[PDB]
């Protein structure tokens, strides 16, 4: 060997100033690098008359999902650039009651975040539609018939009709079906049939 | 001194299509570690406050699942080893969010979701009555 | 400049190779963690956030009525009798299946149409007429 | 066990929601259940229960030959097999075995 054994350089933590831009050191989520973290942090159960294991060669610190990439300074700086990406919520809808008056129909959909190579999840196709019967243009006859048609889908205590659609594979297809069912149920309730006179 | 002179901001276009209104967002995060959820809660709450988003946080009761396995490879029925998988919860309740506002906040927090943590976002969308239900046709 | 470019004509290999040299001068290695995820998202290796469980999945752009209303595929079947009653259960069951595409659902419907055609003689002895 | 108004109203609801309209007994309702769900075999759990052991074993075997993977377990059997040839306990040729 012409040269000696390769010598590891001193860790770059020694070259970091006390007023350095820390978020630049950890831009994204990264595993705990002892040569990159200028903190004398120790982790591990100490032996009798012992000390917690040093950060160097520490596997326990490597298994911690550390938030070094989400320091409070970075979080406030990250949101500053994201303000242009959002939109102002309408000030007219001050409370929930104002929201109900103008938007009486509520649609519920669920999204799941899981770790893996496959993002498919059968539970995401479910679409739930809730609407109060008081906000619908219903007379006495149609309202009484609508409750019987839906059965238990209508809650008398809250006066809220809940329709759950999950037949179609896609969430958008289930959303259309929920809107379609509400349209058909409303019109069919208004329709008066000859056999209804036998009630 | 080697700072950039001019920065090219990402292109954001204000389309003519009206936005979607989300009444509530129930961001529930599940994990095996309470400290990780507490740290993730601090990140999510702080991000919401800086974005002007109303958020309320509560902790759903935890779920623990236990199952029993034989200890010895052969016989010895009376001796068992019992394992458990603790699922700890943390619910984030965002209110009065637009479609664009909820899209950015979710992307910011989902990409920063720690490993071993799953998220279930329940999105409540406000919609008006369909045009066909305005008046009866019969 | 030119009003109407020849975009319809496929560019030659010289044109394609020239464009590659244009991307070379602008090609630089990754500078930080953000640039790696940006490149992966553009290349499609990384998931697109916010998470959509139906990203890249669209079953031939089918509408909800295609999955649910399957009576248009029972025209060949008899309008009344046990066969119509039996196929009504099948269509009702198929309308409740979210794991089968519209094309797959039609295959099940077409299977009974061909099956009863082969078994016309048996059906005739039971006072049932198919086609 | 229902009146005319209740029976027809219930039947009307089934048509609206796409449920079964004609009167069907419990036995024949299984046909609805059969096509409403995937069969047991068609489920991803069933046909993909095992990992492709052909893919896993042959890939590592190929990578071992390419020298990019060192199979410590395989090197153990190769050495043990080699020592048996020196000891004479070599695998007999197929067909031309000890018994004929």
């Amino acid at each position: 060997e012409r040269p000696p054994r390769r010598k590891a350089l001193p860790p770059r933590t020694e070259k970091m100033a006390v007023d350095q831009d820390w978020p630049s050191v950890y831009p994204v989520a990264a595993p705990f690098k002892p040569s990159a973290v200028p903190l004398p942090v120790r982790m591990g159960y100490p032996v009798k008359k012992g000390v917690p294991m040093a950060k160097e060669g520490n596997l326990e610190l490597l298994k911690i999902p550390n938030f070094l990439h989400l320091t409070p300074v970075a979080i406030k700086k990250h949101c500053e650039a994201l303000k242009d990406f959002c939109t102002e919520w309408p000030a007219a809808l001050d409370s929930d009651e104002k929201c109900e008056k103008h938007f009486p129909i509520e649609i519920d959909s669920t999204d799941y975040v899981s770790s893996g190579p496959s993002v498919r999840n059968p539970r995401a196709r479910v679409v739930v539609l809730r609407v109060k019967l008081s906000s619908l243009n219903l007379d006495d006859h149609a309202k009484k018939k609508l409750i019987k048609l839906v059965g238990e889908r209508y809650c008398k205590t809250t006066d809220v009709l809940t329709i759950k659609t999950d037949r179609c594979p896609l969430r958008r297809q289930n959303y259309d079906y929920a809107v379609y069912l509400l349209t058909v149920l409303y019109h069919e309730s208004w329709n008066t049939e000859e056999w209804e006179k036998s009630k | 001194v080697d700072v950039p002179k001019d920065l090219t901001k990402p292109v954001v276009t204000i389309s003519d299509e009206p936005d979607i209104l989300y009444k509530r967002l129930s961001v529930l995060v599940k994990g095996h570690d309470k400290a990780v959820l507490d740290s993730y809660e601090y990140f999510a709450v702080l991000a919401a406050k800086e974005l002007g988003i109303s958020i309320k946080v509560h902790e759903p009761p935890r779920k623990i699942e236990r199952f029993t396995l034989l200890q010895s490879v052969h016989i010895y029925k009376k001796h068992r080893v019992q394992y458990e998988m603790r699922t700890l919860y943390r619910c984030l309740e965002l209110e009065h969010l637009t479609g664009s506002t909820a899209d950015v906040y979710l992307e910011y927090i989902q990409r920063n979701l720690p490993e071993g943590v799953a998220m279930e976002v329940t999105k409540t969308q406000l919609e008006q009555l369909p045009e066909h239900i305005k008046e009866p046709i019969w | 400049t030119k009003e109407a470019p020849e975009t319809d004509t496929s560019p030659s290999l010289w044109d394609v190779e020239f464009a590659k040299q244009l991307a070379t001068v602008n090609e630089q290695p990754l500078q930080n963690g953000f640039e790696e995820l940006i490149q992966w998202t553009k290349e499609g290796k990384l998931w697109e956030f916010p998470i959509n469980n139906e990203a890249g999945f669209d079953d031939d752009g089918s509408e909800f009525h295609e999955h649910i209303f399957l009576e248009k595929h029972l025209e060949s079947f008899p309008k009344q009798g046990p066969i119509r009653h039996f196929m009504e259960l099948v269509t009702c069951g198929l309308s409740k299946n979210p794991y089968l595409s519209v094309k797959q659902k039609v295959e099940h419907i077409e299977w009974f149409r061909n099956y009863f055609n082969e078994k016309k003689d048996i059906l005739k002895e039971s006072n049932i007429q198919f086609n | 066990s229902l009146s005319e108004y209740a029976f027809r109203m219930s039947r009307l609801s089934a048509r609206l929601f796409g449920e079964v309209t004609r009167p069907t007994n419990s036995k024949s309702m299984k046909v609805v259940k059969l096509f409403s769900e995937l069969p047991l075999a068609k489920k991803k759990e069933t046909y993909d229960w095992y990992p492709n052991h052909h893919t896993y074993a042959e890939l590592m075997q190929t990578l071992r030959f390419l020298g990019l993977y060192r199979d410590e377990h395989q090197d153990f059997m190769d050495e043990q097999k080699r020592l048996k040839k020196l000891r004479g306990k070599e695998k007999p040729k197929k067909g031309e075995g000890k018994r004929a």
């Binding site: 058909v184 019109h187 069919e188 | 066909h132 | 009525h65 209303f69 | 005319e4 039947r11 048509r15 009167p23």
Partner: peptide
């Protein structure tokens, strides 16, 4: 005892195809 009634044998009208087909859009 077999209970058969006139209304129990009446086929339900396919209102989706005929009456409410216009509602599949918008």
């Amino acid at each position: 005892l077999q209970s058969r009634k006139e209304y129990e044998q009446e086929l339900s009208d396919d209102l989706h195809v005929e009456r409410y087909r216009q509602f599949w859009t918008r």
